[PDB]
Structure formats: structure tokens, C-alpha cells
Write an enzyme that holds these catalytic residues in place. Structure first.
Site, PDB file in Angstrom:
ATOM      1  N   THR A  32       0.711  -1.284   0.038  1.00 12.20           N
ATOM      2  CA  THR A  32      -0.200   0.045  -0.012  1.00 12.20           C
ATOM      3  C   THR A  32       0.915   1.206  -0.056  1.00 12.20           C
ATOM      4  O   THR A  32       1.676   1.347   0.933  1.00 12.20           O
ATOM      5  CB  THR A  32      -1.024  -0.188   1.067  1.00 12.20           C
ATOM      6  OG1 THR A  32      -1.797  -1.141   0.971  1.00 12.20           O
ATOM      7  CG2 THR A  32      -1.650   1.490   1.569  1.00 12.20           C
ATOM      8  N   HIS A  73      -6.819 -10.905   0.634  1.00 11.54           N
ATOM      9  CA  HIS A  73      -6.315 -10.608   1.647  1.00 11.54           C
ATOM     10  C   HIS A  73      -6.730 -10.910   2.698  1.00 11.54           C
ATOM     11  O   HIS A  73      -8.021 -10.454   3.130  1.00 11.54           O
ATOM     12  CB  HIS A  73      -6.119  -9.071   1.644  1.00 11.54           C
ATOM     13  CG  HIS A  73      -5.252  -8.504   2.529  1.00 11.54           C
ATOM     14  ND1 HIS A  73      -4.675  -8.972   3.695  1.00 11.54           N
ATOM     15  CD2 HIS A  73      -4.778  -6.945   2.785  1.00 11.54           C
ATOM     16  CE1 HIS A  73      -3.848  -8.232   4.377  1.00 11.54           C
ATOM     17  NE2 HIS A  73      -3.875  -7.245   3.739  1.00 11.54           N
ATOM     18  N   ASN A  92      -3.438  -9.514   8.280  1.00 13.21           N
ATOM     19  CA  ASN A  92      -3.301  -8.070   8.902  1.00 13.21           C
ATOM     20  C   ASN A  92      -4.389  -7.428   9.514  1.00 13.21           C
ATOM     21  O   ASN A  92      -4.109  -6.239   9.723  1.00 13.21           O
ATOM     22  CB  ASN A  92      -2.554  -7.316   7.841  1.00 13.21           C
ATOM     23  CG  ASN A  92      -1.364  -7.832   7.157  1.00 13.21           C
ATOM     24  OD1 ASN A  92      -0.444  -8.628   7.797  1.00 13.21           O
ATOM     25  ND2 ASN A  92      -0.871  -7.449   6.040  1.00 13.21           N
ATOM     26  N   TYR A 150      -7.597  -7.087   8.537  1.00 17.29           N
ATOM     27  CA  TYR A 150      -8.513  -6.727   7.851  1.00 17.29           C
ATOM     28  C   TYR A 150      -9.993  -7.717   7.804  1.00 17.29           C
ATOM     29  O   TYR A 150     -10.041  -8.523   8.719  1.00 17.29           O
ATOM     30  CB  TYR A 150      -8.330  -6.405   6.486  1.00 17.29           C
ATOM     31  CG  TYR A 150      -7.228  -5.357   6.400  1.00 17.29           C
ATOM     32  CD1 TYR A 150      -7.403  -4.009   6.950  1.00 17.29           C
ATOM     33  CD2 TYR A 150      -5.760  -5.712   6.471  1.00 17.29           C
ATOM     34  CE1 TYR A 150      -6.512  -3.131   7.188  1.00 17.29           C
ATOM     35  CE2 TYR A 150      -4.721  -4.476   6.539  1.00 17.29           C
ATOM     36  CZ  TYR A 150      -5.137  -3.491   6.999  1.00 17.29           C
ATOM     37  OH  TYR A 150      -4.224  -2.451   7.185  1.00 17.29           O
ATOM     38  N   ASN A 177      -3.527  -4.351  14.029  1.00 19.43           N
ATOM     39  CA  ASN A 177      -5.018  -4.251  13.850  1.00 19.43           C
ATOM     40  C   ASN A 177      -5.825  -5.015  14.862  1.00 19.43           C
ATOM     41  O   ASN A 177      -6.875  -5.486  14.490  1.00 19.43           O
ATOM     42  CB  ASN A 177      -5.500  -4.402  12.424  1.00 19.43           C
ATOM     43  CG  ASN A 177      -5.197  -2.935  11.395  1.00 19.43           C
ATOM     44  OD1 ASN A 177      -4.941  -1.902  12.005  1.00 19.43           O
ATOM     45  ND2 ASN A 177      -4.919  -3.344  10.164  1.00 19.43           N
TER      46      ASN A 177
HETATM   47  C1  LIG Z   1       4.552   0.444   3.314  1.00 18.13           C
HETATM   48  C2  LIG Z   1       4.165  -0.903   3.105  1.00 18.13           C
HETATM   49  C3  LIG Z   1       2.581  -1.287   2.690  1.00 18.13           C
HETATM   50  C4  LIG Z   1       2.240  -2.523   2.788  1.00 18.13           C
HETATM   51  N1  LIG Z   1       1.043  -2.984   2.020  1.00 18.13           N
HETATM   52  C5  LIG Z   1       0.581  -4.250   2.530  1.00 18.13           C
HETATM   53  C6  LIG Z   1      -0.612  -4.226   1.802  1.00 18.13           C
HETATM   54  O1  LIG Z   1      -1.325  -3.441   1.081  1.00 18.13           O
HETATM   55  N2  LIG Z   1      -1.381  -5.644   1.749  1.00 18.13           N
HETATM   56  C7  LIG Z   1      -0.660  -6.776   2.551  1.00 18.13           C
HETATM   57  O2  LIG Z   1      -1.058  -7.743   2.735  1.00 18.13           O
HETATM   58  N3  LIG Z   1       0.686  -6.303   3.097  1.00 18.13           N
HETATM   59  C8  LIG Z   1       1.273  -4.856   3.130  1.00 18.13           C
HETATM   60  N4  LIG Z   1       2.381  -4.909   3.435  1.00 18.13           N
HETATM   61  C9  LIG Z   1       3.122  -6.061   4.173  1.00 18.13           C
HETATM   62  C10 LIG Z   1       3.959  -6.560   3.019  1.00 18.13           C
HETATM   63  O3  LIG Z   1       3.301  -7.120   2.101  1.00 18.13           O
HETATM   64  C11 LIG Z   1       5.122  -7.486   3.508  1.00 18.13           C
HETATM   65  O4  LIG Z   1       4.748  -8.476   4.407  1.00 18.13           O
HETATM   66  C12 LIG Z   1       6.315  -6.920   4.278  1.00 18.13           C
HETATM   67  O5  LIG Z   1       6.903  -5.567   3.631  1.00 18.13           O
HETATM   68  C13 LIG Z   1       7.490  -7.777   4.431  1.00 18.13           C
HETATM   69  O6  LIG Z   1       8.477  -7.285   5.116  1.00 18.13           O
HETATM   70  P1  LIG Z   1       9.613  -6.619   4.533  1.00 18.13           P
HETATM   71  O7  LIG Z   1       9.483  -5.207   4.491  1.00 18.13           O
HETATM   72  O8  LIG Z   1      11.014  -6.753   5.702  1.00 18.13           O
HETATM   73  O9  LIG Z   1      10.056  -7.233   3.406  1.00 18.13           O
HETATM   74  C14 LIG Z   1       2.936  -3.473   3.528  1.00 18.13           C
HETATM   75  C15 LIG Z   1       4.276  -3.353   4.036  1.00 18.13           C
HETATM   76  C16 LIG Z   1       4.694  -2.072   4.070  1.00 18.13           C
HETATM   77  C17 LIG Z   1       6.003  -1.758   4.667  1.00 18.13           C
END
Ligand SMILES: Cc1cc2nc3c(=O)[nH]c(=O)nc-3n(C[C@H](O)[C@H](O)[C@H](O)COP(=O)(O)O)c2cc1C
Length: 383
Positions: free
Chosen positions: A129, A283, A286, A288, A343
Site C-alpha cells: 500500500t 487478503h 493483517n 482486515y 489491527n
Molecule cells: C509500506 C508497506 C505497505 C504494505 N502494504 C501491504 C498491503 O497492502 N497488503 C498486505 O497484505 N501487506 C502489506 N504490507 C506488508 C508487506 O506485504 C510485506 O509482508 C512486508 O513488507 C514484508 O517485510 P519486509 O518489508 O521486511 O520485506 C505492506 C508493508 C509495507 C512496509
């Protein structure tokens, strides 16, 4: 507290693991010895458009700037450099004390088929995101989104999972995240999917429903409910206050309302595939709405959708089955975060949490053995 390893004893298909892997090549080297493991890299794909090259060759990594993760700007979105670009800028700076490993000699760089897609390596862009969608309308950013995804599609054969995308207005509640329900949205998604494909990479849309994580005031403005599994347990005090001030109390979904969400999941998946996506990811992580049903903290229901392991899993599995029927098992994946506490989920302090997720994994394997194996399970690691 514990390990996601239990999933590998149950589900026998591809598993994408994500969480703190970029700075731990020594962990990745061990994990990818398992022939069906893929690795998602989040924060470092934000900051390194050529992350895959850097992982293959053991190059230094661009630092990420968390302050621009969600800012409405090109800065921190489309202006992180490739390694050769960074050297031209005199950057040679990069992440401190990190000792890179060339991972080119490992299964991370062996081809694998996910769904209909022939991946050329196993470094996956997980959903991220970025909050650059336009309000009103939840429209993918017309200025920068194609460039952002094009940059990160640059290594041929990369699997990209999009940022979470709302399946309907009622599923949303953040003004600057994108949706996949309207024609104006799909016009922009089509451009994004075209560019990824022009770079010989692949794209899966993450389908997102917020539940209690939505902002009740935004929903109230748009004439929408504030939804969750239950109506007597709330995400946090700020959300409770917002709901009270917006006069939009958290609402426990009726069975008909659940059915309507399933209908919207099916329509959003169809929209995604029609616009050119390679598949969709549900999804269910997290904290939701689907997670709110899976978790006994958030789900105090006493009907068919709560009160036992099977009942709590019912919504998630109904969505899986509805999507499998609509677009095909080879175009559907599912994301889970068993140990997550984000969450206001329970995580490992709930003694029944492994059983809850083991049940979901088992039901997926059961469907697979009967001829309908999902493309993948995607796990958030407690790292
Ligand atoms: C800025 C940001 C946005 C993210 N948005 C989503 C998302 O929209 N959906 C989701 O399932 N996980 C989201 N995540 C979790 C990531 O998919 C992922 O699991 C995480 O970045 C993995 O850890 P890493 O940053 O150390 O590689 C987000 C993580 C970050 C940092």
C-alpha cells in the site's frame, strides 16, 4: 509466538514467505532449499527497483525512507535509483553494515510456475500500500503508478502482487488507496498491467476489505456502514471515538451482507482478470475483515460464522471457493498472517491460533487433492 513452519506439514503447494528477508540472505539461502518456497521482499523493493539484480549478484542495497511510504509524492515512489544509476550519483549511501550475498547460485534464481505464470526467479514483490490513489473515486495514480510498477517489473519473470485494492465502496474507507470496482479505476489498472507485461513480468491483484480498520467518518460521509464480525469488540480507542463522533457504530455483518461481500469479491476478481491481471490474492491477513472473522478476539459471533474453528474460517473459505469457481484455482492465492497482532489480532498469545490457521491450510490442501489447488499460500512471517 512460534513459527509458520506448521503450514508446510499441511499445504503442499507453493508458499510465499515475507518478512525481514532482504537483510538476511543467510536465512533465505536456507529457506529456498525447499523447492516450493518463494520469498517476498517489501521495504527493499520500495527502495530498490532492481532488487532482483542486487540479490543475484550480492550488491549493496538502497536504504528506504519510511517517511515517504504513504506520502502523495513522486519522491520516495519513483525516484529510487538502480545500482548503476546510484553509482553515477556517487552513492557508492547504501544500507550500513549489511554484508550482501550473491544468491544467484540458489533456488531463488530457479524458475517456477505459479498459476499460469512461468516465473524466472522466486523473489516476489508482495503487496505494498503506497496511498497514492486519487480522491474522489479511489483511482490508481495517473501521474506515477505506471512508472512505479514498470520500474519494479524490470527483471523479466518477476511476480508482482499489487497494493491492496478495494473490491467496492463498502469494502473501503481510506481515500487514497485504490479500488477495482469501477470503470475509471480499471482504465488505470489496465495501463499498469500492460506495462508490467511489456516488461515480461506478471501481476496479481490483492483484493482488500477493511472491516474495522476503515475510518468510520469517511464511510459515514459516503453513506456506508462501519463493518466487522461483531459489534461488541472494537479495534482501538481512536476507532471507537471516531465511530461515535461520525454516528457510525461498528456493525456486525448479517449473513446477507456477507453474501454481498462474496458477490463483490467475485466481481472484483472478474474485473481484474478482464483488465489483464494474471490472478488475484485474497487478503485474509493483517487484521482486515476476513482476519477479523478468523480471530476469536474480534469474532464473538454465535451463528455459523463464529464460535468454533470451522465457523471462524467459513467466510475466508467461502471467498476462496467463490473465486475458484469464477476465475479458476490457478488464478487465486490467499494471504495469511497467523502470528500477526497488527489491527488488534490475537497472534500467538491465543493458544488456539495455530489450530485456526492449520484448519484453513488443511481445507486448502483438501481442495487441492480433489483437483483444485490454489496458485499459492502467502504467509506473513513474524520477523
Ligand atoms: C509500506 C508497506 C505497505 C504494505 N502494504 C501491504 C498491503 O497492502 N497488503 C498486505 O497484505 N501487506 C502489506 N504490507 C506488508 C508487506 O506485504 C510485506 O509482508 C512486508 O513488507 C514484508 O517485510 P519486509 O518489508 O521486511 O520485506 C505492506 C508493508 C509495507 C512496509
Amino acid at each position: 509466538g512460534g513459527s509458520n513452519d506448521f503450514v508446510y506439514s499441511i499445504w503442499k503447494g507453493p508458499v510465499i514467505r515475507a518478512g525481514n528477508f532482504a537483510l538476511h540472505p543467510e536465512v533465505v539461502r536456507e529457506e529456498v532449499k525447499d523447492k516450493r518456497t518463494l520469498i517476498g521482499y517489501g521495504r527493499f523493493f520500495i527502495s530498490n527497483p532492481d532488487l532482483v539484480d542486487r540479490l543475484e549478484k550480492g550488491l549493496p542495497l538502497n536504504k528506504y525512507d519510511r517517511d515517504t511510504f504513504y506520502q502523495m509524492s513522486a519522491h520516495g515512489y519513483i525516484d529510487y535509483p538502480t545500482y548503476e544509476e546510484a553509482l553515477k550519483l556517487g552513492w557508492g549511501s547504501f544500507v550500513k553494515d549489511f554484508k550482501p550475498q550473491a544468491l544467484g547460485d540458489t533456488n531463488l534464481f530457479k524458475p517456477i510456475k505459479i498459476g499460469n505464470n512461468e516465473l524466472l526467479h522466486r523473489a516476489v514483490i508482495p503487496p505494498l500500500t503506497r496511498m497514492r490513489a486519487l480522491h474522489p473515486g479511489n483511482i490508481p495514480n495517473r501521474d506515477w503508478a505506471v512508472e512505479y510498477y514498470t520500474q519494479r517489473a524490470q527483471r523479466p519473470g518477476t511476480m508482482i502482487i499489487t497494493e491492496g485494492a478495494f473490491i467496492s465502496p463498502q469494502a473501503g474507507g481510506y481515500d487514497n488507496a485504490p479500488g477495482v470496482w469501477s470503470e475509471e479505476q480499471m482504465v488505470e489498472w489496465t495501463k499498469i498491467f500492460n506495462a508490467i507485461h511489456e516488461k515480461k513480468s506478471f501481476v496479481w491483484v490483492q483484493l482488500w476489505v477493511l472491516g474495522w480498520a476503515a475510518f468510520p467518518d469517511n464511510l459515514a460521509r459516503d453513506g456506508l456502514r462501519y463493518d466487522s464480525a461483531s459489534d461488541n469488540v472494537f479495534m482501538d480507542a481512536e476507532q471507537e471515538a471516531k465511530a461515535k463522533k461520525a454516528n457510525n457504530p461498528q456493525h456486525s455483518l448479517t449473513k446477507d451482507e456477507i453474501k454481498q461481500y462474496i458477490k463483490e469479491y467475485v466481481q472484483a476478481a472478474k474485473n481484474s482478470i478482464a483488465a489483464g491481471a494474471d490472478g488475484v490474492e485474497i487478503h485474509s491477513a493483517n487484521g482486515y475483515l476476513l482476519n477479523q472473522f478468523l480471530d476469536p478476539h474480534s469474532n464473538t459471533r454465535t451463528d455459523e460464522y463464529g464460535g468454533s474453528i470451522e465457523n471462524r474460517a467459513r467466510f475466508t473459505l467461502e471467498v476462496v471457493d467463490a473465486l475458484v469457481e469464477a476465475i479458476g484455482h490457478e488464478k487465486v492465492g490467499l494471504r495469511l498472517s497467523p502470528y500477526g497482532v497488527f489491527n488488534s489480532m490475537s497472534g500467538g498469545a491465543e493458544t488456539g491460533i495455530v489450530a485456526q490457521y492449520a484448519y484453513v491450510a488443511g481445507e486448502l490442501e483438501k481442495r487441492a487433492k480433489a483437483g483444485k489447488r490454489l496458485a499459492f499460500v502467502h504467509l506473513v512471517e513474524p520477523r
